[PDB]
Each structure stands twice: as structure tokens, then as C-alpha cells.
Amino acid sequence: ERGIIIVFTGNGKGKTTAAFGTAARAVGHGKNVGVVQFIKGTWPNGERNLLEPHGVEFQVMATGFTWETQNREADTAACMAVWQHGKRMLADPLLDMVVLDELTYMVAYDYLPLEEVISALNARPGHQTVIITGRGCHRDILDLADTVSELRPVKHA
């Protein structure tokens, strides 16, 4: 089938879970999936723990990433390194789905060029589906997306 781009944005909770839920279904179906998490959690990775043993490549941002204004050079460089993996995936004809978790902040803080993104998305293997997660998704990215679900928080605990 033709791979599409899906975006899970908005301020509501479940963006990441949605993306991992899709991935889970894909794997359950025998598809090849690759994952990039631009934001390293200070906890244990349930999703990774689950999926990884199933041949799902995982790429997580380095611990060293600081988000500090005076560290833009180093942080940009760490983001670039992790995104290299992402571009590679976005170039793999054998990967049925690619997950770019928390990609929106990387763009929103200018740690990665939107243009590289657009380009990478555009040139991907036709059967490839890509899932983008994160609050405040860049409009240009939304314009390119096939599906956009906005998690609106009706209530939050």
C-alpha cells in the first residue's frame, strides 16, 4: 500500500502512546519498524523493552542533551547525530514504518532543520508510513501529513 504520514499532536496526553500503539500493531502484523525518540526519558522504556526484542531498531537521544541556551552547539550536534539514524531509516526500502517521537520539539527549538525533515519525508520509500509525535507541530509538517489527529485535553490528572 502507499505509506502515509501521520501526526499525533495537540496538548492532550497519549501522543506517544498512539504512535507506539500503531507500531505495536505493525509489528504484530509482521511489518518492519524503526524508531527514533528525540527525547530521552529519565525512566525505564516500557515501549523499548517490549518492541526492541522484536527486531525493532531504537534510537534515543543521548543523555548528554541539555536544552541549555549556552549549549546549543553541543545539543544541536547530539540531535544531528540521532537524526542521521532517522534519515537513514527514512531511506530504507525495507522499513514499513518509521516512528519519530517528540520530533516536534527538535524543530520548535531549531535543533534540526525543518528543511531536512521535509526533504527526508518527501523522498521516502513509497510504502513507508511515518508517525510524528509532539506538541506544536510545525505547520509545514502538518501540510505534508496525510492524517493529523490533535489530542485535545478535555481533562487531565
Q: Which residues are catalytic?
A: 11, 13, 15-17, 25, 65, 67, 102
Q: Closest separation between CB of residue 137 and a copy of itself, Å?
A: 18
- Please state, in angstroms and rounded to a whole number, the distance separating the CA atoms of residues 94 and 73: 34
Q: Closest separation between CB of residue 13 and Cl ion, Å?
A: 5
x-or-dash pattern for Cl ion, window 11-50, by CB under 5 A?
A: ---x-xx---------------------------------
Residues near 130 by beta carbon (within 8 Å), at least 6 away in sequence: 3, 4, 5, 6, 90, 97, 98, 99, 100, 121, 124
CA angle 50, 60, 62 (to 5 degrees): 140
Judged by the rule CB under 8 A, the positions of this chain that interact with a copy of itself are 1-2, 91, 93, 121-128, 144
Using CB positions, name the residue nearest to Cl ion: 16
Chosen from Cl ion, a copy of itself, none, partner binding at 129 (C-beta under 5 to 8 Å by type) = none
Q: Is 14 known to sit in a ligand binding site? A: yes
Q: Closest separation between CB of residue 1 and a copy of itself, Å?
A: 6
List Cα–Cα distances, 10 to 15, 29, 141, 151, in angstroms: 8, 28, 14, 5
Chosen from a copy of itself, Cl ion, none, partner binding at 122 (C-beta under 5 to 8 Å by type) = a copy of itself
> Residue 15: in which H helix or E strand, if any?
helix 15-28
Pick from 14, 13, 21: nearest CA to 97: 21
Residue numbering of the annotated binding site for ATP:
10-16
